Amino acid sequence: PKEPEQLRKLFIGGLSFETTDESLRSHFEQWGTLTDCVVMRDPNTKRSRGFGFVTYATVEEVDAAMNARPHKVDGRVVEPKRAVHLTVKKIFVGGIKEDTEEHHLRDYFEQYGKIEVIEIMTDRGSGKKRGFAFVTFDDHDSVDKIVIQKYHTVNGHNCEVRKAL
Ligand SMILES: Cn1cc(C(N)=O)c(C(F)F)n1
């Protein structure tokens, strides 16, 4: 069956006020089938609110659109984000215990995005591993993909992953 619609939507901020449902659709249809595409407008003036949303038929199409950023739509670089926004580039990874190392976290998380920092947390007094880590990516979409998954398995551990700061 189909992925939930919420996970197939992209909120597009920073639109040109000249962008229309039709021009937004013509642009974003390059990366997949769009089941919905709307520019938000003022109810009285019909002047654009400068943002809108598109709904793809599949999550893989959302991924393709995000991987094709930056998007210049009607002459303006826009800001697409997956639907709920707390936009951050860093995650907390908990439940990794004492045997999880940098390469375990890198080999898994590098498939969500480009990693800039991996910080495996150690005890200030003893140096022993505390069983959690932070991963910083170059871009927020990695984190957005990560936190919507129900499960993360790293080094055989069932991990708790959340947005950090
Ligand atoms: C400066 N900066 C870059 C990003 C990004 N590419 O994802 C963010 C975050 F807020 F979305 N901040």
Curated annotation (Swiss-Prot):
Signal peptide: none annotated. GO terms for molecular function: DNA binding; G-rich strand telomeric DNA binding; identical protein binding; miRNA binding; pre-mRNA binding; protein domain specific binding; RNA binding; single-stranded DNA binding. GO terms for biological process: alternative mRNA splicing, via spliceosome; cellular response to glucose starvation; cellular response to sodium arsenite; import into nucleus; mRNA splicing, via spliceosome; mRNA transport; negative regulation of telomere maintenance via telomerase; nuclear export. One of its GO terms (cellular component) is cytoplasm. Residues 85-165 are annotated as: Globular B domain. There is a cross-link at K2, K72, K163 (Glycyl lysine isopeptide (Lys-Gly) (interchain with G-Cter in SUMO2)). Keywords: Acetylation, Amyotrophic lateral sclerosis, Cytoplasm, Disease variant, Host-virus interaction, Isopeptide bond, Methylation, mRNA processing, mRNA splicing, mRNA transport, Neurodegeneration, Nucleus, Phosphoprotein, Repeat, Ribonucleoprotein, RNA-binding, Spliceosome, Transport, Ubl conjugation. It is found in: Nucleus; Cytoplasm. Residues 1-84 are annotated as: Globular A domain. The modification Phosphoserine is found at S16. Residues 8-84, 89-165 form the RRM domain. Its main location: nucleus. Sumoylated. The keyword Acetylation applies. The keyword Acetylation applies. It comes from the Eukaryota. There is a cross-link at K97 (Glycyl lysine isopeptide (Lys-Gly) (interchain with G-Cter in SUMO)). Involved in the packaging of pre-mRNA into hnRNP particles, transport of poly(A) mRNA from the nucleus to the cytoplasm and modulation of splice site selection. Plays a role in the splicing of pyruvate kinase PKM by binding repressively to sequences flanking PKM exon 9, inhibiting exon 9 inclusion and resulting in exon 10 inclusion and production of the PKM M2 isoform. Binds to the IRES and thereby inhibits the translation of the apoptosis protease activating factor APAF1. May bind to specific miRNA hairpins. Identified in the spliceosome C complex. Identified in a IGF2BP1-dependent mRNP granule complex containing untranslated mRNAs. Interacts with SEPT6. Interacts with C9orf72. Interacts with KHDRBS1. Interacts with UBQLN2. Interacts with PPIA/CYPA. Interacts (via the RGG-box) with the HOXB-AS3 peptide; the interaction inhibits binding of HNRNPA1 to the intronic sequences flanking exon 9 of the PKM gene, preventing inclusion of exon 9 and promoting inclusion of exon 10 which suppresses formation of the PKM M2 isoform and promotes production of the M1 isoform. (Microbial infection) Interacts with HCV NS5B and with the 5'-UTR and 3'-UTR of HCV RNA. It is linked to Inclusion body myopathy with early-onset Paget disease with or without frontotemporal dementia 3: An autosomal dominant disease characterized by disabling muscle weakness clinically resembling to limb girdle muscular dystrophy, osteolytic bone lesions consistent with Paget disease, and premature frontotemporal dementia. Clinical features show incomplete penetrance. This is Heterogeneous nuclear ribonucleoprotein A1. It comes from Homo sapiens. The gene is HNRNPA1. The chain holds residues 7 to 181 of 372 of the full protein.
